[PDB]
Structures are given as structure tokens and as C-alpha cells.
From a paper:
The SARS-CoV-2 main protease (Mpro), a cysteine protease with essential functions in viral replication, has been validated as an effective drug target. Mpro is a cysteine protease that contains a catalytic dyad consisting of the nucleophilic cysteine 145 (C145) and histidine 41 (H41). It proteolytically processes the viral polyproteins pp1a and pp1ab at no less than 11 cleavage sites, and thereby also ensures its own release. In this work, we demonstrate that the SARS-CoV-2 Mpro is subject to redox regulation in vitro and contains multiple redox switches including a disulfide-dithiol switch between the catalytic residue C145 and C117, as well as a SONOS switch of residues C22, C44 and K61.
In addition, we produced single, double and triple mutants with individual and combined exchanges of the SONOS bridge residues C22, C44 and K61 including residue Y54 that directly interacts with C44. Interestingly, variant Y54F, in which the tyrosine that interacts with SONOS residue C44 is replaced, shows a similar catalytic deficiency (19%) as variant C44S suggesting that both residues are required for full catalytic competence of the active site. To define the structural basis of the markedly reduced enzymatic activity in variants C44S and Y54F, we crystallized both variants and compared the atomic structure with the known structure of the wild-type enzyme (X-ray statistics in Supplementary Table 1). In the case of variant C44S, we were able to obtain a structural snapshot of the covalent acyl intermediate formed with the C-terminal glutamine of a symmetry-related Mpro molecule as previously reported for wild-type Mpro. This structural analysis reveals in both cases small structural changes mostly confined to the active site, notably of residue H41 that forms the catalytic dyad with C145. The structural changes for K61A are clearly more pronounced than observed for variants C44S (0.89/0.91 Å) and Y54F (0.24 Å), highlighting the structural importance of K61.
Author numbering:
A (entry chain A), B (entry chain A): 1 to 306
The structure:
């Protein structure tokens, strides 16, 4: 029993982190096979970041201008190219610690673990969600760029995020491992609007199911609702609309607990309209939305990895 | 910027987890050098756990009755002994992935990371605190016994916790790596009282300092207090008393933010007396107490590990 925000074990990703230095800029890179992936802004000075022309800046850089260090050993760079907002440095040695992996572009509302790193070295691991407005609420300081987010399925690491920017609002933006930003953000130090940060309704419902499984039941009510009725409430509270796809994803949790999805929706509706009257659910005094239905099933059944 | 409950990278501990089977009971063990540590209840059936005589039960077990499996390879057990509530299985091979390590018995209110494992395989990592009543609020299912908690200092893993029991209240109890339980608990399936779970005041104050550092300032008030005045309030709300030792530990955070410790105490006092009026601090609608002052400094400055 118990329910905790839980990250994937980070060991397979630890063995992939390196330090990349170009000129006087140092950040983190991801070493898989004979390629090192890192944010293209590694080629920028603080001044360049105000209005960079990455193509023109990269024209000045040769292979030998990119220092790549893994632990205390130097990798030889034999090729470089820019793909969207990431650089790919071809090195002469395949990472012997490369796990089985793939690159995935995740959907808003999905979750993933972040291994925060500085100077190529791991600092910590935490769980977070791609917000509906395509930001993440992370914990990143200067030098953390190139940190990656990932999910693990048994022995295979799906990399989904590389950290690039902190918006002036303090939230974070970054790319997939092909270098395409999530959301409308650019790798330039300019004001950028994220947009309304809505709550991930299907995740809140999964977490309520998790609460029931663990004995937190007080919020169950005698009401039901309909999808359209519930969604009228959701709109008012800046919750994402719930679709039948979402209902389908919640099916197994509905089955396990015997609580129809729409009954749980009606319990969520009363929570949105009446608040939590100073009570808590799974140790939280607000509705948590950074657990997916799959996260709940995983944690509640003890799925392991290599 | 940003502030997240963050665990240590788990890779050094992943390489130490093995599966231990005795008869029909399987749980996790920790393989360091040529010794495997695991809960002594591995020798018990579900029936034995009602009223075990561990000495008498262990007398029946020989080295060859303990199956130890690391990945898909079997370790040869050449000796066994019981130390308090842990078994130590001497094996014929030193773990080649053994990190630098020590065993530490932590104080109530300290934090540590837990690598939850099943059948010797890692499932996830999360951060938690040794409560003042010597329980932890973890996420553990059947088979998770032998999971360990740890801290990391650069390249050295300090193991501080091994999981043994879930109390009927749903909270968790376990031992240090010498096998001595934290708190009054025993490894028997009987009712056991934890006692009043108080809030870790010094950790709440560190977290308030973390909030200020990140721009969450609304809770700062115009008041100050004294240690005795504050502690009268703390007693009323089941907060641990604050000592001058705690004030000293908060000194660097006081210095960084320019907020005297007792001024922050007065802000906490008003929060306890008036609640949070539906506001949040660092994304939480209650006062968080599972960050130590050292955790705040670490995260706010980006300390890394090998």
C-alpha cells in the first residue's frame, strides 16, 4: 500500500550522460551508440542567445571545437550536424553502456522521469508531466540544459525530452530527441507565452482511482453525471475535456474498483465545486494530475524493469 | 528555478539488487562485496510470520537453502548468519558493481531515496523521510521487502534503510543495514502502534526558504517571534519543537535570503493559525516537511554525483 510520485530507475540513463563544451559554454549531452545529442545553443554565448542565427554560428565551428567528456575521458568528435534544435556529434567510440532505446515524441498529459544533470554528472531524478500547454514544471538551474526525460518499458529506454530553456515565468521548455520543441517555443532568450495551463482530467481521475485502491474513499459521493455535464464543469475549472478515449483508458481501474468512470467524474465534479474542506487525498490537499492511468496501474501492481 | 521532490540517481544501487529465495518466499537482497543482506523473514512462511521464532527457524536452513540470483546468474552461498533482523549470506563472488558505500543509521526527520524492487528488479525510485515516529510513508507491495533507502555523497552510497513490514495502518517500517529496526517495531505480523506522527518543523522552514528563493513570497508577514513562543504554537499543531541546533542548520538559508530564522518562524506560525486560505506554496496546498535544509541547499545549487 501507499502511493508515491515515483520515477523510473535512472541507471540506464546515467551511463549515457556526458559533458559537452563549445567555446566557453558547457552543458549536458546524451551519448548513444557513436552519437552525442545536445542542445544546439551550446554554440551560443549569453549574448548570442538574445537573437541567434544558429546556421551562421555553427558555420564557424569545426569538429575539434566540440569537447565531449565522459567521466574523465575525452571522446574524439569526427562529425557534427544540426537537426532542428539539437546537435548530433558523431564520435569515434560507441557508448559501451548504451541501453536498448528509442526516441518518442510524447503527447500532452503524458508523464516521464527527468535525470537532472550538471557538467555531465547526475544530480537527481524526479517525475513530471508534459503540461497541456507543452511546458514542464521542472527543477533546472543554469548548466542543466541537455538533461533528458525518459520512460522505461522493461529493458528499453524511450527518450522523450531534452531540456533547453527556462521561460521568464519559471516553467521549462525543451524538445524531443529529434530537436523539435514541444509547443510554440524557440531557443532564443525572448519573452514567450506558454498559454493557459489546464489540468489533465484523465490523470486526476486515475489518481482518484489510486486513492480508492489505497483506502482514501471519503470523496466518493452518491451522484453520477454524463460526459457533457461533466465537461461543462471541466471547462469552468480549466480542466481538459474528457473524451471517450479517456474513459476507455480508465476502464481497467474502473473494473478493479467497481466504480463506473462517470460516477468518479461526479465525485470529481463535487470536489471542483465544493473544494476539499481541508481534507486530503493520498496526502495531498489539491487534486494531483501528474499520474497517468498507466502510471497508476504500474505502481499498483509492481511492474519492474531490467 | 523550480523545486521538485527529487531522489538521488539510483544506478549505483540498481547494480546491487538481487533476488533471494528461501523455500517458497522470495524478496530482495543487497549484494555488496561478497555479502548479500536481506530481511531475515525470508525464512518465514505466511503462517510463521504470525509468531516467528527466527533462531529456531534458521536452525533448519543450510547455505544451499538460500537461492541468490543476480540478473539471470546464480550466486553460490558459502555462509549465512543472522544479525539482528537481517540475514547476511556470504557468497563466493564479490559484486563487481559494488559502489563505495557505508551503512548509516539516520535520525528522525532525515530524508533518503528508496529504490522499490520486486524479485530483485528495480521498479521505481522516490524520496521520503524517516518520520518522527520512525515509520516511513512509502509505496510498497508484497515482494518489496529488502528494498533499500540510501543517500549519496559524490561517489559514496550511504545505505540507511531496508524495508521489512507494512503496519496495518498502511505505513511502513524497516531497519538499518545492521538489522536494527527504526522505532519500536518487530518483524512479526501483529498489531503495532506507531505513535503520534508529528511534523518535521525544521524541514518545513527549509521548504519555506526554498519557496522564497523561487519567488513564492506571499506568506512572508510583518511579524517575528521567539523560540519559546513559536514552540508553544508548534506543540498545539503537533509540530516537533525547534531547537537552537535547528536554527543553526538553517543559517545558510537565512543568510542567502536575508530572512532571520525567527521571522520565518513567525510566518509559519501565522500559516498554522490561519491556514493557507486556498493558496499554494511551491505547488502544494499544505506545508511540506520531507525536505531537509541540506536537501534545499543541494537542489538550489545543483550538487552532482559521480
Amino acid at each position: 500500500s501507499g502511493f508515491r510520485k515515483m520515477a523510473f530507475p535512472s541507471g540506464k540513463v546515467e551511463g549515457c550522460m556526458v559533458q559537452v563544451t563549445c567555446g566557453t559554454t558547457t552543458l549536458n549531452g546524451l551519448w548513444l551508440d557513436d552519437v552525442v545529442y545536445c542542445p544546439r545553443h551550446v554554440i551560443c554565448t549569453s549574448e548570442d542567445m538574445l537573437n541567434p542565427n544558429f546556421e551562421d554560428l555553427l558555420i564557424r565551428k569545426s569538429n575539434h571545437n566540440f569537447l565531449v567528456q565522459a567521466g574523465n575521458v575525452q571522446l574524439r568528435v569526427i562529425g557534427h550536424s544540426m537537426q532542428n534544435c539539437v546537435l548530433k556529434l558523431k564520435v569515434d567510440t560507441a557508448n559501451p553502456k548504451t541501453p536498448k532505446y528509442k526516441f518518442v515524441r510524447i503527447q500532452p498529459g503524458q508523464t516521464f522521469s527527468v535525470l537532472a544533470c550538471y557538467n555531465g554528472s547526475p544530480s537527481g531524478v524526479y517525475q513530471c508531466a508534459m503540461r497541456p500547454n507543452f511546458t514542464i514544471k521542472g527543477s533546472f538551474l543554469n548548466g542543466s540544459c541537455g538533461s533528458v526525460g525518459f520512460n522505461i518499458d522493461y529493458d528499453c529506454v524511450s527518450f522523450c525530452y531534452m531540456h533547453h530553456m527556462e521561460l521568464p515565468t519559471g516553467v521549462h521548455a525543451g524538445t524531443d530527441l529529434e530537436g523539435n520543441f514541444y509547443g510554440p517555443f524557440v531557443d532564443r532568450q525572448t519573452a514567450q507565452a506558454a498559454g493557459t495551463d489546464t489540468t489533465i482530467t484523465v490523470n486526476v481521475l486515475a489518481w482518484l482511482y489510486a486513492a480508492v485502491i489505497n483506502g482514501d474513499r471519503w470523496f466518493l459521493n452518491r451522484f453520477t453525471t454524463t460526459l457533457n455535464d461533466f465537461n461543462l464543469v471541466a471547462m469552468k475549472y480549466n480542466y481538459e475535456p474528457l473524451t471517450q478515449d479517456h474513459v476507455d483508458i480508465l476502464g481497467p481501474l474502473s473494473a478493479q474498483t467497481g466504480i463506473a468512470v462517470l460516477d468518479m467524474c461526479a465525485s470529481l465534479k463535487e470536489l471542483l465545486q465544493n473544494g476539499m474542506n481541508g481534507r486530503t487525498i493520498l496526502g495531498s490537499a489539491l487534486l494531483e494530475d501528474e499520474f497517468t492511468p498507466f502510471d497508476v496501474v504500474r505502481q499498483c501492481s509492481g511492474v519492474t524493469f531490467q
